Amino acid sequence: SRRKWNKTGHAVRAIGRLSSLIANVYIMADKQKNGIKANFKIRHNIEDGGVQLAYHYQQNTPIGDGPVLLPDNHYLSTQSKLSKDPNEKRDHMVLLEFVTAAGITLKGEELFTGVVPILVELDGDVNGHKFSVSGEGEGDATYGKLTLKFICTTGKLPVPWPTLVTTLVQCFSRYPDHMKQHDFFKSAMPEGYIQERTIFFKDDGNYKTRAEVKFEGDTLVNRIELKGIDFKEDGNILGHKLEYNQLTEEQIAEFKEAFSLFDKDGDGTITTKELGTVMRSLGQNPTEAELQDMINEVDADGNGTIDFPEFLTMMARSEEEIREAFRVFDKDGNGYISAAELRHVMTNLGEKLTDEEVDEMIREADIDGDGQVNYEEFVQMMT
Amino acid sequence: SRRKWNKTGHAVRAIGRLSSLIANVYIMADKQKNGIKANFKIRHNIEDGGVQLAYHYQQNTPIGDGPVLLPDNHYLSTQSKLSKDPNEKRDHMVLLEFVTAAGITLKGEELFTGVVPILVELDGDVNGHKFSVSGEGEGDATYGKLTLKFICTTGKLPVPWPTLVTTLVQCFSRYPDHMKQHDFFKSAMPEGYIQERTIFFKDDGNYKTRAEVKFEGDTLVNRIELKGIDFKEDGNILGHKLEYNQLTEEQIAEFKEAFSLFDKDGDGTITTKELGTVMRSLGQNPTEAELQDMINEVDADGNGTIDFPEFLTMMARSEEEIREAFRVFDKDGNGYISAAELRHVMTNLGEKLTDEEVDEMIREADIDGDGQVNYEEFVQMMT
Ligand SMILES: [Ca+2]
Ligand SMILES: [Ca+2]
Ligand SMILES: [Ca+2]
Ligand SMILES: [Ca+2]
Ligand SMILES: [Ca+2]
Ligand SMILES: [Ca+2]
Ligand SMILES: [Ca+2]
Ligand SMILES: [Ca+2]
């Protein structure tokens, strides 16, 4: 009996474990409307345990008359991080999001090659409670990245912030090279698109939304109207019973800097060619098969290259990792990292620093004043 | 300077982190010899820190005259677990291994459809130290699985057990359906093959091995001669400085039992069809896209189905997982799992048990004697 509970417990948990690993945004063409439709589920964590489901139905149509790209079926994958600004007294949300497209094997776009300013404006009415939200920040589609801050401009927000995240610019998603012809969102720009949703909160009310997303000069603007009906006074939404919120923003900034040493052409992905070049410049000799297998281990989407969200996952997932790192730096294996050896590694990686900056790095690590870094000093610096 | 150490530390560690995630056995055809060649590296952990590399070079040739299958390039992926038998006074090793083939996108074999007995015999000479090893157990290629116990028949083994693992039957590897034409090993049977290696222990001696692997009646036999030269008296090998050794064997047996509830045709893999059937019989309604995405999350080899080693990884990688499992069992959501509800889940999963056995499961969990299982009782049973 204790064995039967184990066997059937494992199976039921396997299914849970399989299901909670996914919340993709499934996109399909809508030819008759010269646009797309999407559907997906969001699971909002309830503060003291449990999940509140939010079922999303989406349609998008172009605003302008020029041709747009209508895709084959595919999906977006997202990771969101919510935080608070310690200096802000107004009701507010700070948001960092990474989004990439996947699901397919093997002029608007030029508007998105660099960092683009974003404005967001929402006017809402949930069960009669009128409120407004204003948001500003920037998007960098090279990295599938959004960073934004939102304020409630009418006082206290009558709903939880996490319930507004999906409503509050999919044109900033990263489409990999093999899927460029499937990016409706950027194809619609600069004239833009209309995006409409219905969002059903299980056992509670629904939101209906309509938004215009378009360029106004060089700023990508998302202007939205939202109406919520049939919400329960003491449900998870009007009762504020959902969790609000991981690495820090500055920890993520460090990993971007590291990622740039491999991504030498700045296209947002590390190929086998780029990884091999960095490995060989440090004295190592992987085969092409090994490079492919290395990438394949962290390759979310099977396109054969490592983008920034992939790289992040990997570096957020040891004593022995640090010993091997030491060996890479200690070229002649005598037990000490010399300023010459450090300068060499920096050059090999592509980092440009003066001899003075390299000595400053030695100084930061050099506890015993011999002007070299030993293994224990290196550990202290790595931890 | 503290930021520069972070950035360049991250890059160097990324490479370490990328490299240590792989130790594949790379196979190529050797047409002139009507066989294959392989090369790979093994990293043996040194007891107090560090790794001892062991560079492997391999050739295999058929013993008999009938046609064999010569493959496209591809690799095997392995996981080994070493243990000791608490009842055995002789110098010995207990081994459980899982091996699958990958590296390609999208009559001998019939000898391997079930469980096959294995005998292993080795005679060796390392730096003049003559010794022998005998091993017995079984292989089940459906699951890529080997289970064996080895004894040193000459007394104390003069080398570490982990150094003999690769020498001590790749015919038990699991080749997935799309790679059946690339399985040299099974194609050579029953007459068998000769397998030869050179194994270079970095900074130390080398092993040369020659073995005959073939059927003798219904037993797969591996008979080996090994010669080791140029070893250092105080190196990691003759000095026994390597680590010997994870889930238990009986924990792994439980997961096999669970896996069988999904793998209803016993072929060793879970398709999307099989996962959906089990999910729907428990009242859930995934789309085909969701099923594919679920599998793809644990899919080591991109063949679109879940084999047993994949399933194991996943279940060895929470309070909320158990709450959702409870909900699956508590069909009517009243807070209590009834014997009727339990019987229903068992039937839905395919488990056959009498009503008496189901009441015994209730009894094992039922702390307060009401003949039903509540949430707290279910937690106790799951932990
Ligand atoms: Ca690049
Ligand atoms: Ca990729
Ligand atoms: Ca040195
Ligand atoms: Ca020093
Ligand atoms: Ca099956
Ligand atoms: Ca698979
Ligand atoms: Ca019930
Ligand atoms: Ca009870």
From Swiss-Prot, chains A, B:
Changing Q170H: In P4; leads to no detectable fluorescence. In mut2.2; shifts fluorescence lifetime from 3.03 to 1.94 ns. In mut3.3; shifts fluorescence lifetime from 3.03 to 1.88 ns. Changing I229V: In EBFP2.0; shifts the excitation and emission spectra to shorter wavelengths and increases quantum yields compared to BFP. Changing V25I: In Azurite; shifts the excitation and emission spectra to shorter wavelengths and increases quantum yields compared to BFP. Transmembrane segments: none annotated. Photocytes. Changing S173A: Increases fluorescence at warmer temperatures such as 37 degrees Celsius. In GFPmut 3; highly fluorescent mutant when excited at 488 nm. Changing V68A: In mut1.5; shifts fluorescence lifetime from 3.03 to 2.72 ns. Pfam families: GFP. It comes from the Eukaryota. The keyword Iron does not apply. Energy-transfer acceptor. Its role is to transduce the blue chemiluminescence of the protein aequorin into green fluorescent light by energy transfer. Fluoresces in vivo upon receiving energy from the Ca(2+)-activated photoprotein aequorin. This is Green fluorescent protein. It comes from Aequorea victoria. The lineage of its organism: Eukaryota, Metazoa, Cnidaria, Hydrozoa, Hydroidolina.
